[PDB]
Amino acid sequence: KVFGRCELAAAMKRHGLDNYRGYSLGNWVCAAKFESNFNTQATNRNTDGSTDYGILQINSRWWCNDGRTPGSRNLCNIPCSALLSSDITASVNCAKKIVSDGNGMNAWVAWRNRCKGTDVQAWIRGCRL
């Protein structure tokens, strides 16, 4: 599923991501935009052989099981495929664990490079929330 901007902002808010670990909703929408262009079916293969999955491009090195990332963990206790669902519940639940890990949203290199320090409220501007 390709979410609309305000559609994804609403789904994230309903799943409690708005101000989670102090990150306003526009931070999460901005990260999703640059990670996946709001596509739940987004995938990216890393040089190390791990894969990033879903709207927030969560990686198999630590967070999900895909059966093909030697030495990896599954800290979110999910198959990586769950991160590609039209239902963002698994992606949100796992994002909450990631952002709690110590480095906040720096865990998402695209957030640090493209969202951090910008006017992220523009990503929820005009949305009925």
Residues interacting with Na ion, by CB under 5 A? 60, 65, 69, 72, 74
At 49, the amino acid letter reads G
The secondary structure of residue 122, as a DSSP letter, is G
Active site residue 7: no
Question: Which residue is catalytic, options 35, 48, 66, 119?
Answer: 35
> Binding residue per annotation — 87?
no
d(CA 95, CA 52) in angstroms, rounded, equals: 13
Nearer to Na ion, 36 or 72 (CB): 72
Specify whether the CB–CB gap between 45 and 59 falls below 8 A: no
Question: Which residue is catalytic, options 18, 52, 66, 119?
Answer: 52
Q: Residue 69, exposed/middle/buried by CB under 10 A (0-12, 13-18, 19+)? A: buried
Nearer to Na ion, 46 or 103 (CB): 46
Q: Least CB distance from residue 50 to Na ion, whole Å? A: 7
Catalytic residue positions? 35, 52
- Write out the binding residues: 101
